[PDB]
Design a protein around this ligand. Sequence first.
Ligand SMILES: CSCC[C@H](NC=O)C(=O)N[C@@H](C)C(=O)O
Ligand SMILES: CSCC[C@H](NC=O)C(=O)N[C@@H](C)C(=O)O
Ligand code: NA
Ligand code: NA
Ligand code: NA
Ligand code: NA
Lengths: 168, 168
Amino acid sequence: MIRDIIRMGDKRLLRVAPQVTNLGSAELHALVSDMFETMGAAHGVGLAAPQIAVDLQLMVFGFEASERYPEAPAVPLTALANAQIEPLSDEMENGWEGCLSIPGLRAVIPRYRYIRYRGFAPDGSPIEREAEGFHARVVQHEYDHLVGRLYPSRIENFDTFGFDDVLS
Amino acid sequence: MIRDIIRMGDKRLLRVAPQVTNLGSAELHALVSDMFETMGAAHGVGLAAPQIAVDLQLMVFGFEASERYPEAPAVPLTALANAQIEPLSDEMENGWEGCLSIPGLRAVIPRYRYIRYRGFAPDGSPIEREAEGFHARVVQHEYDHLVGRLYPSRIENFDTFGFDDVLS
Ligand SMILES: CSCC[C@H](NC=O)C(=O)N[C@@H](C)C(=O)O
Ligand SMILES: CSCC[C@H](NC=O)C(=O)N[C@@H](C)C(=O)O
Ligand code: NA
Ligand code: NA
Ligand code: NA
Ligand code: NA
């Protein structure tokens, strides 16, 4: 079932989401199914549960290939609960992001180039991976959603903030 | 003639505009006529020349009444060239702004509560006024456009940044 994506301005995107506690459940599998479906219909590369007004530490992401980010390597399709994230150096990297809760826009956002993330797959198997570049960025971006944070609060150069069809 | 309003992302909104040097001219009157017309069609309370891709220190503003800002007192309809602005105290005030170059959005922006602004009417008569509250805010907002600045770079609380129909 495709869910409605709530847009910036909605208080529900500003919450700190509680943990998932129903790993391996039919309810959770259904929710993640919906998230993948919803992410697909909106052409996202990630999607965070709060974006569909469900207050939980849960995200999905990945693609074989992206139209939006053609140079991006494949990122494994992943559903991740109770994510925690750790930078593996201080090195930052700028890159383009946009948000489905902020349709039509993008900006350049600095993110850690290298991270580790940990959590659980929906069946309850533990996940821990090191990630870099775009893979890392995506997970940081989704992580932010889980703590009530959106990319505009991280823009440093506002000359890069603009509409997709316009930006130059 | 209604002009196209360029949207955030366009480099032309990021320029520092040169002075108007054709006060009292038919060309300038025509340009301001267009600006008032354009501002009217888009339901603005101000509009800055760079928003219609004309690189000049020129702005129009004012209304008898605003649907968008019903509590706002009338601000005199004004066309102002070569504006300069001076705060009259350090007191700041938060209020809602939106931008026609950023359709659909608004945020809370701190502005000087009290200013003086100076410049010329299109016929070349000098204008100097003291202004407060909403009158002041509008002129600051348009002034920003003339130096390559947009309101997102002044947002301090990003919880207030959001879509019009959503914000709560
Ligand atoms: C590259 S980081 C952006 C990840 C998000 N998911 C957000 O919750 C997107 O898929 N964004 C799309 C819309 C994009 O960047 O164009
Ligand atoms: C109240 S300050 C906003 C002034 C601008 N003019 C900008 O160049 C507007 O008229 N904004 C409208 C769209 C609004 O605030 O809703
Ligand atoms: Na928040
Ligand atoms: Na975008
Ligand atoms: Na600028
Ligand atoms: Na608005």
